[PDB]
Design a protein around this ligand. Structure first.
Ligand code: NAG
Ligand code: NAG
Ligand code: NAG
Lengths: 504, 101, 50, 101, 504, 50, 101, 504, 50
């Protein structure tokens, strides 16, 4: 039920006999996977986790100085000398100053003056690199089990039945994971962290308990003191003159000064930069998509063998409507019959009693055996006016529903979305290895690209007339001697035969 | 002020209170009266400015010099900070700018 | 809008009878546009028998 | 130092000799002791630097200020030249360059 | 005799009856004018004089300052104010400085500080403009009067007979001047100071008792204090901040400083500049040519009526030879006969006694009546070998002379030089006013362009055969029915007839 | 050089006799170049009669 | 310091100890007090710097001269080396480079 | 046996009746000379010796100064003067310094100051030239006398039988040498030191007990003090100002300084230079080849008249194989029969007993008469598999051997090597003097170029069939009227007849 | 390699008999290439008589 209130929601349906199915997950969206006999699953990607990041360079915005010393020699004495020059922690500058009888020596000529002082970095910021083997994605998996749908369980402490929700950590070391959903069964996932945001031109900047991302060509352009890329208590700094300002000149000395806090300059320069969050030493990124392949072999239903409900069904409120034309129904059941299957139908008139639409949640069931229990389901009503009927006998309730739009419009939108998805799945879509899965791959993707329109167009899914139409179309394409008219017709005929062979 | 000698050179530890006054001490040559005109002198703290100030003949006026003695050249040292708050003046106002992006 | 979706859903519910009626009305026009008008007539009268 | 008043404002003509020492004068409020810490003070000559130095509370110590009195704000003025040779320091060393042709 | 030792020397000959004649004078050369009955004149241009030049702008390289004052206000007080701001002699600058409790007032914000000081220009340089009406040319005129030719009279104090030399000042106000040569006569000169060096893109720079010329498109580009030319004791200056360097603002003051002498910078920038000389307020320029027209109406000879010399003539040294193939002869006369005409002839053999060349100095004569006197003459020997004979009777002396080259070569060189001269005389060459002077003008310039070759080519100047050749050429060109053969032949015939009608 | 200037000056001294000799020798050649050689012969023998 | 005369000219052999002090000797004119302000003076060793220092009138201040006596011009000479180790300073640091090949 | 372990080894064979033979020796290789009746010789060139080298120029890297003096004169006094100026050991410089009342004299102008000091070269390096008459080559000559082949005699102290090894010093003074090998006989050698490394653009640089070779165009380019080679205690130097640095400008004096040790600069500049070794005053060079001509007239064998060995032969170890496909055999003989000839054969099968290969060591013999003695021989096995048999009777021993490659390949390689050798022997190959040696020369070089292939190709060296083939080829080439078919065929026929006439 | 050197040495040991066999087998082929195959056959069977 985690996929209900999401703006960017898709719909993926696989072949009836097709166990494998590929999907793409975006960091701001969700994916709903449904089948004929398998329960509906909902996949979401929460956060990109970066851990164990190496350090490349650290800059020092605010620094201090101490023990300023200077030494002056006038002409015919050579260059000035100081013992602290050989020390790596003391920075000095040389210069030439005018001298005379007022300064101690007689010959009038410019003298050599040197001035150095210590350098201590009181505050600093750091830059880290990001390697593909360090990334770790987190995906939550939910199951439509006719849950109550109440938002009271925000954290992961409790109120989360381990058979209804799960979390999976996809790492670059082992991309193959086995997910256990308890009574529902087990699934397999193989995710490939590719075609994401480039991490070869990005540096993770940590500064004053805040974090940003910067460009590598800009990080080296910054004009501040910097050290070598090693972990040392005290490291040989470089280009520290940019933080120590020397006066013009003096006949006997030179007084250096240190610049103030450069935090404001960095905050102003990083205005148009991306931000992130961090916990301890790990970082969280909210950008990046993922491609995955799911194997659904041991996944089954939970209430397929249950009986019918012989109690009283009642609406809890007016059924709401989502942006994707899906209707959520919240039912309250009275009686004590235990877990029983919920008899619900969608038709065009109260006397017709003919299924006209499909259900997003397969096998709606009540979870507890209480007297007055509650449950929720999600369905897809047909375009136009429709009637939802719940229950049997003289106690069955009916409700009117309306939905705007057109079937052809939705079909074309879904076809375009599937084409865009298949275009995103450029690599790792087919397999050119052992033979026997190539035809399976071409059938699988033609299904994933055309089934949304096949189900919407070809009548009431009789599975008998469509085969005859395909046969007659193959015959019409066969008895044609002209070029470019038999190949396309036979291809379309085979496509329709295969799409009818799959689940409708 | 304190007067010491470490390695045949005289150091004059002058605090903030002795600012603008002369002082007489003793050297191997004899008595030495040395005047101090330190303008940027501060209180006692780790930030210590030290510079040799040279001997000169009394028949010349000091030019761009704030320390002078007459026995030899004397090294002066004094702290430079504000209200003994362990903080330098650091009033540079350079305001270095960085590229945006 | 209000009636197009209804007749569209009706056509999609039982397309066999709809195609039978369409192919019947196709051969009952004197001109091409007249055949088009006759089949759109059948398309419009299809939802309500009355 | 000379102390005069021209238009309800006090001028203190301080020569080179009175450098780094305080002076007490009288105002309409009463006696005023004013300290002068002029570092770039020179001899008496037409080139005269003049700047108002302000009154301040005793508890707050001066900071990057070389003149302060406690009755009111007092305008200080003193010459700036070398050895009374009627010549300014003019040590700018800008070395402005001109286009060749 | 001032035109003997000059590298760039020309020769101008006018028509016999033609009084007017045009010439061009270059600042590095000379002009010799000769005629049949008129004495030879020598014109030279010495110096271009510029006087009464207006002033355009004045710069100040070295300046002083005095009475520096400043005023600072911290926030919640407004802009700073000073009484010396309204004065034009005091320059100030504004700025914003950080303030706090350490600076006098309470509120922690930055304030407004202003600082101004007086400005006095101790040394300055000036710039003047040059107008055409200010220029004044000086031309010296010498007369070949068989002078001794000694260079002992350099200045204009004495040793300059007023009938043998003269000076003329050509001004733009009155270009018509009347020259008096004493006994020789009077001439008229009309000179037009045109086609000279352009004075619309030049400025006369005066600095430290030295002078230069600069470009207007650079004089205004200089970055220094300046002020226009206004007669006053105190001048208002503009853009003086370029000479006063302000120290970085302190807590509550600002100490300005003045730059040193910029004489070295100006001397370095003016390295590739033109120089000149000056006397008082006048300037001297050594570049610029001139065009003139001379009217020789009242000019006559001095010794035409004198008798012959019956004394003893002797050579004083070996006759020298100049670059233009002219021979100077220095004679010493013994005897007391008074001023007498010098009998000198140039021939090819001692027995021939036939005049083969011409004389550059007309009517050679002795000036004094002393016993042993001296004189000088300048002649042009014919190409090849020749004999110069001086005197008559059994005391006449002879001397051999040789000159290389060819008559056709000299003729072609003189023709090309005359063509170049006529091309320089673009305007004011002919007159399109009243009729009767147009034919005179065309004849005059065809003479000045072709007489040098006419005299060199057409035989021995018999004046009788040339007329017959012209007549036969006119007849040959007349009896010709073909085109482009009669016009050119008749034109050449008329040209030759006219050139023979003139002086040869 | 040494003789060209002499004969040139001779021609320029008495051009009538020189032109007479030239026009006499012009009509005593069989070809154009032969006439040119004959007149240059007269030009060369002109200074010295001998 | 030693004072000698070889060929009507006075040589003053001054060692390192007599640095910055005046000395009085006798000449044919009379007593002569001559001051020496040699800064780079060294110990006694073969490397000997020798230069004439000139007489001048006492009514003028010295401008670029470190030796001055008043009888005549006197030639001064003194060694230039370090710690009497028979080694010159030779601190030129020219570092002349040669072509590779 | 000195030529066994050499990578660059050749093989030279001369004509049977040809006494003279030419060879080329490389400084990194060896030469083996064999014949039909003469013993095998081995020539090697050890070292090039250079002695009595003249000196051309000497430089001084480290120098000292002493007795610095200066003299200054202010204007109106002329140029400064010093007595030490005329001395060649004192270098001074002149200059102009500003003077005034502070410097001694009144007039305000700049004066002339001069400053000189002594110059003493404490350390220096030298440069020598190399003349062809100074070079001396050393060649060692070894004889294959079935020596033990033990490498225990490295130096020339002992363990070198004077009849088995010899040393020869080839000098430019006398290139003709007579070598005595004791019992073997005497040979003659004429070597021409030509076509070697050029010594007209090389200088031998000696510095700090080390030695290098430099280019003459670079040696003169160096900017340091220098002086030519003149035997004296005190030398005059030139261009010493490059090592003495003078200060800027002082009114009364100028203090010069001397540069430090320039050994590091020279060591850095001589990085890419060639090195050598030296002993005393002589130098050793390891580059340079040589051409020689050997006359073998009195050279004979030693054990040609000896008898056969009737003792016991045994192998001492597995016979080794060299890079040139040669097999060394080390035999141990038991018995006391005195010096006897070693019966050894090479065949293809134990029952064939037919000589299929040749021997590099002619007449293998035992040297001593001891009971258990040892000896060594070097042979060339045929390509493929072969059997080496030693001894006769029932005590003869056999050994299998294999050698890869092809006979045609070795033949072509030897032909190409001989062609390259004959191309190296450009001059002094033939004689154009008296007739009778021209045919000898052409036969000699065609033999030395083609015998390696003649012996390998033309059957089993029957000396009877080859003559018949040559005769029939001459006949086939004779009875042919076509061009370009008779000349080549007759030439090849004569070539084959001559190659069969020589030794096989 | 293993057999080429053997037959080469055999040919070089007794070239007369080898050339005799070659010239005998040369004239026993119908075509040029057939003669080449026949002589290479003799070349190959030459080492081992069997
Ligand atoms: C330094 O000068 C003072 C000035 O009064 C004097 O008393 C003292 O003796 C001098 N020291 C010396 C000459 O060593
Ligand atoms: C200024 O301060 C001094 C400090 O002792 C004091 O004596 C004087 O009275 C004060 N003047 C005033 C408050 O006007
Ligand atoms: C040098 O000057 C001193 C000044 O005290 C004087 O005593 C001495 O006699 C002078 N020497 C002379 C004039 O030779």
């Amino acid at each position: 039920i985690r996929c209900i209130g999401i703006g960017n929601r898709d719909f993926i349906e696989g072949m009836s006999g097709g166990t494998w199915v590929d999907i793409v997950l975006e960091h701001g969206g969700c994916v709903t996977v449904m089948s004929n006999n398998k329960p509906t699953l909902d996949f979401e990607l929460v956060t990109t986790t970066a851990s164990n990041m190496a350090e490349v360079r650290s800059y020092c915005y605010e620094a201090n100085i101490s023990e300023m010393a200077s030494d002056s020699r006038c002409p015919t004495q050579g260059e000035a000398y100081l013992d602290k020059m050989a020390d790596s922690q003391f920075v000095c500058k040389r210069g030439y100053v005018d001298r005379g009888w007022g300064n101690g020596c007689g010959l009038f000529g410019k003298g050599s003056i040197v001035t150095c002082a210590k350098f201590t970095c009181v505050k600093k910021l750091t830059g880290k690199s990001i390697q593909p083997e360090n990334l770790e994605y987190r995906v939550l998996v939910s199951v439509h089990a006719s849950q109550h749908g109440g938002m009271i369980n925000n954290d992961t402490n409790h109120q989360h039945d381990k058979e209804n929700r799960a979390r999976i950590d996809i790492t670059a070391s082992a991309p193959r994971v086995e997910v256990e959903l308890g009574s529902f069964g087990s699934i397999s996932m193989e995710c490939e962290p590719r075609s994401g945001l480039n991490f070869g031109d990005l540096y993770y900047l940590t500064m004053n308990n805040k974090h940003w991302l910067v460009n590598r060509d800009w990080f080296h352009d910054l004009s501040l003191p910097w050290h070598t890329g090693a972990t040392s208590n005290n490291h040989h700094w470089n280009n520290k003159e940019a933080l120590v300002e020397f006066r013009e000149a003096h006949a006997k000395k030179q007084t250096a000064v240190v610049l103030g806090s450069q935090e404001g300059a960095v905050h102003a320069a990083l205005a148009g930069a991306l931000e992130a969050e961090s916990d301890g030493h790990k970082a969280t990124i909210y950008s990046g998509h993922l491609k995955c392949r799911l194997k659904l072999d041991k996944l089954r239903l939970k209430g397929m063998s249950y009986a019918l409900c012989t109690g009283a069904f009642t609406f809890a409120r007016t059924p709401s409507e989502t942006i994707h034309g899906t209707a959520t129904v919240e039912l309250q059941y009275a009686g004590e019959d235990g877990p029983c299957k919920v008899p619900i139908v969608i038709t065009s008139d109260t006397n017709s009693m003919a299924s006209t639409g499909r259900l997003i949640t397969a096998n709606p069931v009540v979870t507890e055996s209480g007297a007055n229990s509650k449950m929720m389901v999600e369905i897809d009503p047909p375009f136009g006016d429709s009637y939802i009927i719940v229950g049997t006998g003289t106690t069955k309730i009916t409700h009117h529903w309306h939905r705007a739009g057109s079937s052809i419009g939705r079909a074309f939108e879904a076809t375009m979305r599937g084409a865009k998805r298949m275009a995103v799945l450029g690599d790792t879509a087919w397999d050119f290895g052992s033979v026997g899965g190539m035809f399976n791959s071409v059938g699988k993707f033609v299904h994933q690209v055309f089934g949304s329109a096949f189900k919407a167009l070809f009548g009431g899914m009789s599975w008998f007339t469509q085969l005859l139409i395909g046969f007659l179309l193959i015959w019409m394409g066969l008895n044609a001697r002209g070029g470019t008219v038999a190949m396309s017709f036979m291809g379309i005929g085979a496509m329709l035969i295969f799409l009818a062979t799959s689940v409708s | 002020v304190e007067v010491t000698k470490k390695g045949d050179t005289y150091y004059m530890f002058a605090d903030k209170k002795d600012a603008g006054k002369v002082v007489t001490f003793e050297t191997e040559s004899g008595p030495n009266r040395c005047s101090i005109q330190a303008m940027d002198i501060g209180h006692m703290c780790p930030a210590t400015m030290s510079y040799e100030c040279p001997v000169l003949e009394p028949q010349y006026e000091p030019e761009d010099v704030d320390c002078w003695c007459n026995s030899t050249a004397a090294w002066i040292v004094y702290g430079t900070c504000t209200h003994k708050t362990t903080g330098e003046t650091r009033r540079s106002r350079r305001s270095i700018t960085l590229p945006s992006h």
